[PDB]
């Protein structure tokens, strides 16, 4: 598959995020327990709540489509559907909102992805969400200064950075510590304080942010200069326009 046109680093990074054969660079290690804490849906050691009985316990009639589609593990179990939501700075965060939704529906099964300017969300069965979330948090999808895990009060994608290079957060869930140069997650994604903070590593430096970013800007790579990418967008506009009129 092709994924996206263009000849910039931005375009290549957009392709790489979508391509499930591209190995996402892992930048930080997070424990299973800390991913559960960040998500904030259940406490460590708490059983997965259920929304319906295990599929095995149900008495479903013959359906060729069901038979051919393997349910994700959390569907088999009857897990609740839960979410993880990220905000990405327009100051060169590595991932960005449509990049995420496009990538998620290439890489992940059973996924409900939503894109907005200030927030991007995936909803799926809880145990599967935990596995996906580890990857979203440990890899280059995430920078702990220019991205934020936020289930509410999302403002900041379009704001100026603070003096530490951190994105604004009304609820200050991610705190830069000068003494380590590392960011700690001190609250879960909905804003409730964690008993013990989670190390999220060092912010990426300017050079590395520019290598990895998927936003086009005049002070990075400008979209207007990725003429092949613009060409395809204009093509789609014209072909849609013609088709709506007379199917030519």
């Amino acid at each position: 598959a092709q994924y996206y046109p263009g000849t910039t680093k931005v375009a290549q990074n957009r392709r790489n995020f979508c391509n499930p054969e591209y190995e996402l660079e892992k930048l930080r290690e997070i424990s299973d327990e800390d991913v559960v804490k960040i998500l904030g849906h259940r406490a460590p050691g708490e059983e997965y709540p259920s929304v319906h009985p295990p599929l095995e316990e149900m008495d479903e009639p013959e359906d060729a489509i069901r038979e051919m589609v393997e349910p994700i593990d959390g569907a088999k179990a009857g897990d609740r559907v839960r979410y993880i939501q990220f905000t990405d700075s327009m100051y060169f965060a590595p991932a960005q909102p449509y990049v995420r939704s496009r990538a998620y529906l290439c890489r992940y099964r059973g996924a409900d992805a939503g894109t907005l300017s200030g927030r991007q969300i995936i909803e799926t069965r809880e145990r599967d969400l935990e596995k996906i979330s580890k990857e979203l948090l440990e890899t280059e999808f995430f920078d702990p200064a220019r991205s934020g895990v936020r289930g509410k009060s999302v403002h900041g994608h379009s704001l100026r950075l603070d003096e530490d290079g951190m994105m604004f957060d009304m609820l200050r869930r991610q705190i830069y510590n000068k003494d380590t140069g590392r960011v700690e997650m001190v609250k879960n994604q909905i804003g409730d304080e964690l008993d013990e903070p989670v190390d999220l590593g060092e912010p990426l430096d300017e050079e590395t942010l520019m290598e990895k970013t998927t936003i086009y800007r005049v002070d990075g790579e400008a979209y207007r200069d990725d003429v092949e990418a613009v060409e395809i967008m204009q093509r789609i506009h014209v072909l849609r326009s013609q088709g709506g009129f007379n199917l030519e």
Binding site: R66, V69, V81, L105, A113, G244
Partner: protein
């Protein structure tokens, strides 16, 4: 004859039924099983005799939480259902051997009613079904128990609700898949104002049958609306065939190939490969490490892409066994496939647009709700001309119990009655059989 296209038709197990069927044999305008389904949905009513009885006994008539103290009437309606139904049938039929059906269900708690087709032949629209049924049962109940002049208006309220003070039959104890003509978003929309949960209920959550019924209703509406007239007709027919009738087993085979481990993205890759293999698309231009695809048959590309969209919903929402992400699939299947190919997405962006608003209105404070309460007449989901809602029906068929406003919650009376009707429950079977029968008359 008008179009040269032929399609191969299969059953809901993926087995060939008939090869080389002319496309127009599937047209709502030509296929006698689509006609039978549409006329059947116009004429069928579910009567809740138990509900009528309970409303009367408690004087709870006229809508939610309403009650008139002192008006209670205790009538043994369910215990006398056979007599009441027979008396109602005498009034509903036009002649004694016509196609009127009145059948008791649930030990007399419910009745299936099919009002004779001849009443609709001399009607402007479809409201004769609830209105003739309602008055026949009101009169039959009154006559069964010799309900007085002074009390009979309570029977009327228990059957049809607050109408005509309300525009709708508010509090009624009858149900139809159609809704009243005043609620149409536009002229021609009535076959679109059929809740997705009703379609899923009637087809007993069989995914392919739910998709087929929804597609039949949506694309038949496109003919009534004039959208499938002239330049657009073939596009709509190919969409019916490939997205809703599993033409050429394309939906089925894409699901087979992607069901074990696949994603929306993997379905897209397979569909583009298949379109290329079949000569529907071709490389038009080479950019830098990027092939720009073109087509000489936009309607066929659209149909192939629509089949892939259905398969992607089945794979994505089937894997989750949770319907909510159908709004996401409908969006990103289309968004991704445009940047994958350089070709326009299904319905030239209109599925994608529908999906944007449907996503919003199924994940926000402002309106909408869960996938099952939408329909082709809903302001959020009317925009695509038949290519979105059938995917929502498939997704809800595949939901294992994640929805509060499920078909069990919204559509139980519809389920009990309308699933009895073979052509409603298994429409793919009957439409394919009818297409094979008329194949040499096109």
């Amino acid at each position: 004859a008008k179009f040269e296209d032929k399609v191969d038709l299969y059953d809901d197990r993926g087995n060939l039924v008939e090869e080389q069927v002319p496309l127009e044999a599937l047209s709502p305008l030509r296929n006698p099983a689509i006609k039978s389904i549409v006329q059947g949905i116009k004429r069928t009513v579910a009567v809740n005799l138990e509900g009528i009885e309970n409303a009367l006994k408690t004087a709870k008539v006229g809508g939610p939480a309403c009650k008139i103290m002192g008006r209670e009437l205790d009538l043994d309606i369910v215990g006398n259902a056979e007599s009441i139904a027979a008396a109602a049938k005498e009034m509903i039929q036009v002649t004694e051997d016509d196609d009127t059906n009145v059948e008791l269900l649930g030990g007399g708690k419910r009745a299936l009613v099919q009002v004779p087709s001849a009443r609709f032949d001399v009607a402007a629209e479809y409201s004769a079904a609830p209105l003739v049924t309602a008055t026949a049962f009101v009169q039959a109940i009154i006559n069964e128990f010799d309900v007085s002049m002074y009390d009979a208006n309570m029977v009327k309220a228990a059957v049809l609700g607050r109408y005509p003070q309300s525009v709708e039959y508010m509090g009624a104890n009858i149900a139809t898949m159609l809704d009243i003509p005043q609620k149409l978003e536009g002229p021609g929309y009535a076959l679109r104002n059929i809740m997705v949960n009703h379609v899923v209920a009637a087809t007993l959550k069989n995914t392919l049958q739910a998709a087929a019924l929804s597609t039949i209703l949506e694309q038949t509406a496109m003919f009534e609306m004039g959208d499938a007239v002239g330049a657009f007709e073939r596009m709509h027919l190919l969409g019916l065939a490939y997205q809703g009738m599993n033409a050429d087993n394309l939906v089925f085979d894409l699901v087979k190939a992607n069901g074990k481990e696949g994603t929306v993205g993997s379905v897209i890759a397979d569909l583009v490969e298949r379109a290329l293999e079949d000569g529907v698309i071709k490389v038009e231009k080479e950019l830098t490490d990027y092939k720009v695809y073109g087509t000489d048959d936009l309607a066929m590309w659209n149909a192939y892409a629509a089949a892939g969209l259905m398969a992607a919903t089945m794979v994505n929402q089937g894997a989750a066994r949770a319907a909510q992400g159908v709004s996401s699939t409908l969006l990103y299947y289309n968004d991704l496939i445009e940047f994958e190919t350089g070709l326009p997405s299904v319905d030239f962006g209109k599925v994608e647009g529908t999906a944007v608003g449907f996503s919003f209105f199924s994940h926000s404070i402002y309106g909408g709700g869960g996938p099952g309460i939408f329909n082709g007449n809903h302001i959020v989901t009317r925009h695509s001309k038949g290519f979105a809602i059938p995917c929502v029906a498939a997704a809800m068929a595949l939901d294992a119990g994640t929805q509060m406003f499920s078909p069990e919650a919204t559509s139980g009376l519809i389920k009990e009655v309308f699933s009895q009707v073979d052509e409603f429950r298994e429409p793919l079977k009957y439409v394919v059989e009818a297409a094979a029968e008329i194949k040499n008359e096109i």
